[PDB]
Amino acid sequence: PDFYCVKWIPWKGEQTPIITQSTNGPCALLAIMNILFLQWKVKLPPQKEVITSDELMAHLGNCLLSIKPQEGLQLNFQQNVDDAMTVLPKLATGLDVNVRFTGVSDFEYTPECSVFDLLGIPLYHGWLVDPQSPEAVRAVGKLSYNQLVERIITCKHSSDTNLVTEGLIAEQFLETTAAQLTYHGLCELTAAAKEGELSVFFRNNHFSTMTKHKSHLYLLVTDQGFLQEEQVVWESLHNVDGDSCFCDSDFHLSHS
C-alpha cells in the first residue's frame, strides 16, 4: 500500500507510463494521476518500474500550481486553488464522496471536489434513481447517501407512517441498488459523457479512470495483475453487470 507499479504501454503514438493499484483501496490518486500521464501532463523516465504516494503526490501539486486561471471561477478560482492545495495530501489515504442521486455529475461539495473542478477533469457516478419508479423520485429527492442515511434513521422514529412510509421505501432503494450503479445511471452516464476525453468514475467508495470510445464507456485496467500485457489496456462498461471484453490502446480486442 506504500509503493505502486508502473505499466508501460504504447498509447497515442509513443510509449506512455500508467499506475496499477493491487491493494484496491478508496484510492483516487492512481485514478487522477493516471489521466495526467496519458495526457502526458507528467512525463516519467522510461526506466521507472515503480513510484511512491510521495512521488505521485508532489507531481500533482506542481501540476495543480501550474494552472493559470480561465477568467465561472474568477478570484473564486484563487480560493478554489487554496481549497484543493490544502486537502491535496488527503488523496494519499482516501476520500469519501457524498454522491447525490439526481444526476451523474451531482455530489455534495467536498473541498477535495476542488482538485477535479480545477484540473478540468469530470467526476461521474452510476448510482442514479430510476424515474421509471415513481416512489424514489419523491422518496429520495435531491438527498445524498450520507444525508439519506441520517434521514432514514429519523423516519424509523417518527410516530407518523406518512414519513415512515418514505423511510421504508428509501431502505428499498439501497438494500436493492446496492452495487453503486443502476441500468438508468449507466445509460444517463453515456449521455453526459463526451467521446475520447478521460474522466473519473465513483463506485463502492472506489475510483476508476474512464472514457467513451465509439459511443460505449470503457474504463482503464488499474488492476496490477494484467501487467506485461501492453495490449490489455481498457475494460468495458458496456453492461449493467456481467463480463467485459479487454482492448489495446486503439480499442482492438486482446487475449491473454
Residue numbers in the entry: 111 to 181, 185 to 369
In the authors' words:
MINDY1 and MINDY2 are members of the MINDY family of deubiquitinases (DUBs) that have exquisite specificity for cleaving K48-polyUb, yet we have a poor understanding of their catalytic mechanism. Here, we analyze the crystal structures of MINDY1 and MINDY2 alone and in complex with monoUb, di-, and penta-K48-polyUb, identifying 5 distinct Ub binding sites in the catalytic domain that explain how these DUBs sense both Ub chain length and linkage type to cleave K48-polyUb chains. The activity of MINDY1/2 is inhibited by the Cys-loop, and we find that substrate interaction relieves autoinhibition to activate these DUBs. We also find that MINDY1/2 use a non-canonical catalytic triad composed of Cys-His-Thr.
P138 sits in a hydrophobic pocket formed by A141, I142, L204, L208, F229, and F320 to function as an anchor point for the Cys loop. Based on these observations, we predict that P138 modulates the dynamics of the Cys loop, as it provides rigidity to the loop by anchoring itself into the hydrophobic pocket. Hence, the mutation of P138 to alanine should dislodge the hydrophobic pocket interactions and result in a more dynamic, flexible loop. To test this possibility, we determined the crystal structures of the MINDY1 P138A mutant on its own and in complex with K48-Ub2. As hypothesized, the absence of P138 results in a less-extensive engagement with the hydrophobic pocket, resulting in a more mobile Cys loop, as suggested by higher b-factors of its residues. In contrast to the WT enzyme, the P138A mutant was readily modified by UbPrg, thereby supporting our notion that the P138A mutation makes the Cys loop more flexible to reduce the steric hinderance to Ub binding. Next, we determined enzyme kinetics using fluorescently labeled K48-linked pentaUb, which revealed that MINDY1 P138A mutant is a much more active enzyme with >10-fold higher kcat and ∼3-fold lower Km compared to MINDY1 WT. A chain cleavage assay with these mutants shows that disrupted anchoring (P138A or P138G) increases chain cleavage, whereas increased hydrophobicity of the side chain impairs DUB activity.
